[PDB]
Structure formats: structure tokens, C-alpha cells
């Protein structure tokens, strides 16, 4: 599997980075949405994880969404593909 491997990108920035995963690994996407001292900000992080488990949790006024993926270069935020 090939996943996009990017650290905290601004909402409207595309991940140009990739990584061939290890065995049993899936594509994960972590989206953080919430208020900053620069306004309401959306970030996205992507990587090869050993066991991905989907979750949506509001943590101290920050919506944190983790999603999971089995197809190559599929860890793209919903607002991009």
C-alpha cells in the first residue's frame, strides 16, 4: 500500500508526499477543526498506521476526525477528493 504521509497541512494544501507502507498497515487521515488565535482552522495529517480505528471526538473545542483506508493514495480529506 502507498499512503500520503504529511504532517499538519492547512485545509487548502495538497499532500505531495508518499510512503510505501509495511504489512498490515492502512491509510489514515486525521482532520482537526477548531478555533485558533488566527481564526477557525482546519488541518489534515496523513500516514501509514499499523491498526487504524475510525473516531470523531470533540476535544476541548476541537473536532478531531480519524478515518481509515485500504486503497493506494486514498488518504485524501473529503474536501479534496
Amino acid at each position: 500500500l502507498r499512503c500520503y504521509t504529511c504532517k499538519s497541512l492547512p485545509r487548502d494544501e495538497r499532500c505531495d508526499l508518499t510512503q510505501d507502507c509495511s504489512h498490515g498497515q492502512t491509510c489514515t487521515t486525521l482532520i482537526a477543526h477548531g478555533n485558533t488565535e488566527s481564526g477557525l482552522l482546519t488541518t489534515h495529517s496523513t500516514w501509514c498506521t499499523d491498526s487504524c480505528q475510525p473516531i470523531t471526538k470533540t476535544v476541548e473545542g476541537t473536532q478531531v476526525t480519524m478515518t481509515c483506508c485500504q486503497s493506494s493514495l486514498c488518504n485524501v480529506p473529503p474536501w479534496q477528493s
Binding site: K7, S8, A32, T36, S38, V59, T62
Partner: protein
């Protein structure tokens, strides 16, 4: 055969799951019929509990508790309580000398069981407390064949600290010797618990010097750090599913900096009953933090922070708070102070918690406390290593950098990468 074992002063009471507090039935050496009367199950493993020094000459209240925990965990096993109370209620250096005779009585009893009923010594686990760990070790050295296990529960230190291997617990006494050191406070030879590693795996909870929940607020107060070794072991018997992890480290100081949180080739092990019976050339001295009460388990994290500034600033004895948020739960306002906080310098440190937060998501960092403008450091990333899960996690600032200002708003960091170490 009773004539051949008449000189033995130690008594061997075979307790049951329904009757854990009293020495009701005795396994009398040389009287094979007593083994049947007490209903010893020849198909099951044997746990021999050996008490320590007793100022009152009667069982300390931990004995029915351990016996209860051993039958809960292993219901078909045999829990024998070794009674050497008269030898244990003497001036300490007298009682400490008696461990050689109690050891001899224990070995002769183990050998009589082997000889009379072909009982395997590979099915014998000796659990000795304080003076009892030394007598367990002396016993182990005198068996015809090695016993499978000896668990030393904070073995006694005075007169044993400089004692040679035949006179104390040593790794040679059983196939596997595991030790829990919980009251090593004092200078060598003047510490209640033994300081020196005496097993194959020597575990030092909270540095081993003293235990949490034991600062002030029969002689129960003076002994809780010593006796915590039994309760740490009881807790391991009661939680087979969630063992407490111990980590091999160069020193207790390096473990306090979060430097030793690795599981690669027995650098981590289970504290207690579920320990992986790994023998090594040199003993692995291991460390962990614990709670003050049962369930004792905590979660250990190493936190690495690079503090970036414009101008060259140095601040000493600075107090901070760290909040960790996961998928399961959270653990907020965890305090830690740093001796020096400099510009463009990285700091590592251990953070621990009783809370199972799960998989980390968010990290909040607060710098605790006009003639001067409040100092500050720009922080882009925080790396975290989780010992229990064996995961290297990276957190990065929500914006380009998270400004950490003294007495101001906390810096917020979200997870941007995960890696499994295995």
C-alpha cells in the same frame, strides 16, 4: 518415617480457597497420610508462602490476602503457608540467622515431597517476604533439583547486603528468581529492603527507595513501603489481563528523564506473576512508576520538547502543566518542573498517569507563573513515546508554531504522525 523429620521446627499449613486465614491443616514431614488428609492435589502447581520478621509472633494481615489472591488466580493450585513465627519473633539479627534453619526445613520438606510422592520441583514457586525471601533462597539452594520459581518480595537488607550468595537469595537458588525492591531507602547495609540485585529480574517500583502513599498521613506506618511488594504482587495476581510494565534502565535517574521506555529483547517485562521467565548473564535492574492504591498500574510517556526563541533567554526552576487527550479518555493538568529552560534547546522527561487515555489525539502545554513582559518560546512539535503501547507519536502545532508564554494561554498540539516500535 516421622523420626527422620522430628527436628524440623517450621510448620507447613495447606490452606484452601474457602479457608485462607487459618493454619487448619498441616502437611507434616515424614507422615505421607497428612498430604491426603489436607487434600493436596498432586496434579497442580505448589505456591509456598514464607513470611518475614514478626514483632508479635503472629501472622501479619497480608498473609490471608496473598493466599486469597493466589487461589483466585490459580484455583486448582496448593497454597502452603510456612510457619516459622517463633524463629521470626526474636531480635532481628537472631531471626536473620534463623533463615538458614528455616531454609533447611523448607528444602527437607520439598525433598520429602519429591522422594515420597515423586512431586516435581519444577511445579514449585516459593514466595518469600523480607527474611522469608532469604530463607526461600536458602531452601532453593538445598533442594535435590532446582525449584521452578522464587519471588523475593522486598528481601531484608541488614545482614544480607554484604552477605555471600549461600547466605541470601541469589539467582542460582531457582530456575527463575524474580525480585521486587520497594524500601531500599538508607545507606547500603542500613536499608530495610535489599539494594543490590539478587535475582534474574530485579524490579524497583518508584526508584525502589520508597513507595507512593507511604509518607506519614502493629508498626503499619513504618512498614507500608516494605509490604507494598506483596500488594504489588497481589495486584498482578488479580489483573492477569492488564499487567504493570517494568523497564530495564542504566539507573533510576535515567528512567526519571523518560530515557528507558523500550520493549526490545526483554528491556521491558511484566511486574509480578505474568513475568516472562527470561534468564540473563547480568541481572536486569528494572523500573516503573505506580499509583498509591490497588490497581497500581500507570501509563508511562517520554515527552521531548524543543523550545525556540529569537533572543538568548535562560529560565531556571520553571513549572509547567501537560494535558493529554485520547480516544478513550483524558488526563489534564499533569505537573512537571524543568531545572533549566533555554533558547533553541531540547528537553526530555517522563510523564505518567493512572488514566487509560487510549490512543493520543491532543496535547496541551501550560507554562505556569507589569515591570517585565512575560517570557515566551515558540514550539512547532512535541514528540511522545508511549511505553505500554510502544508507539512514537508526533504532535504538531495547530498553526505554524504554538507560542508558549509564561502565565498565559496553553499551547495546543494535535497528532500528526504515529509509528509502532513492537
Amino acid at each position: 518415617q516421622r523420626r527422620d523429620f522430628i527436628d524440623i521446627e517450621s510448620k507447613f499449613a495447606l490452606r484452601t480457597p474457602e479457608d485462607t486465614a487459618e493454619d487448619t491443616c498441616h502437611l507434616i514431614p515424614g507422615v505421607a497420610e497428612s498430604v491426603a488428609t489436607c487434600h493436596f492435589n498432586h496434579s497442580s502447581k505448589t505456591f509456598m508462602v514464607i513470611h518475614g520478621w514478626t514483632v508479635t509472633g503472629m501472622y501479619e494481615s497480608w498473609v490471608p490476602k496473598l493466599v486469597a489472591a493466589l487461589y483466585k488466580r490459580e484455583p486448582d493450585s496448593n497454597v502452603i503457608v510456612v510457619d516459622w513465627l517463633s524463629r521470626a519473633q526474636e531480635h532481628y539479627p537472631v531471626s536473620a540467622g534463623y533463615t538458614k534453619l528455616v531454609g533447611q526445613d523448607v528444602a527437607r520438606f520439598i525433598n520429602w515431597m519429591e522422594e515420597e510422592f515423586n512431586y516435581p520441583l519444577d511445579n514449585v514457586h516459593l514466595l518469600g517476604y523480607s527474611l522469608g525471601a532469604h530463607a526461600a533462597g536458602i531452601a532453593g539452594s538445598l533442594t535435590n533439583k532446582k525449584v521452578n520459581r522464587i519471588t523475593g518480595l522486598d528481601p531484608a537488607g541488614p545482614n544480607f547486603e554484604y552477605a555471600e550468595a549461600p547466605s541470601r537469595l541469589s539467582p542460582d537458588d531457582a530456575d527463575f528468581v524474580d525480585v521486587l525492591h520497594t524500601f531500599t531507602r538508607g545507606s547500603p547495609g542500613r536499608s530495610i529492603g535489599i539494594q543490590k540485585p539478587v535475582g534474574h529480574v530485579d524490579i524497583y517500583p518508584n526508584g525502589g527507595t520508597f513507595q507512593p502513599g507511604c509518607n506519614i498521613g502493629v508498626d503499619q506506618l513504618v512498614k507500608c513501603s516494605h509490604e507494598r511488594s506483596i500488594h504489588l504482587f497481589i495486584d498482578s495476581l488479580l489483573n492477569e489481563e492488564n499487567p504493570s510494565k517494568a523497564y530495564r534502565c542504566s539507573s533510576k535517574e535515567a528512567f526519571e528523564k523518560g530515557l528507558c521506555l523500550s520493549c526490545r529483547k526483554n528491556r521491558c517485562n511484566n511486574l509480578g506473576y505474568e513475568i516472562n521467565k527470561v534468564r540473563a548473564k547480568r541481572s536486569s535492574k528494572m523500573y516503573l512508576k505506580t499509583r498509591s492504591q490497588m490497581p497500581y498500574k500507570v501509563f508511562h510517556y517520554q515527552v521531548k520538547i524543543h523550545f525556540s526563541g529569537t533572543e538568548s533567554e535562560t529560565h531556571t526552576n520553571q513549572a509547567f502543566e501537560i494535558s493529554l487527550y485520547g480516544t478513550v479518555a483524558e488526563s489534564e493538568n499533569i505537573p512537571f518542573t524543568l531545572p533549566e529552560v533555554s533558547t533553541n534547546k531540547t528537553y526530555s522527561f517522563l510523564i505518567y498517569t493512572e488514566v487509560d487515555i487510549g490512543e493520543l489525539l491532543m496535547l496541551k502545554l501550560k507554562w505556569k507563573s507589569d515591570w517585565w513582559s512575560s517570557p515566551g518560546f515558540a514550539i512547532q512539535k512535541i514528540r511522545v513515546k508511549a511505553g505500554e503501547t510502544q508507539k512514537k507519536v508526533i504532535f504538531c502545532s495547530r498553526e505554524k508554531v504554538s507560542h508558549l508564554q509564561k502565565g498565559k494561554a496553553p499551547a495546543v498540539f494535535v497528532k500528526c504522525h504515529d509509528k509502532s516500535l513492537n
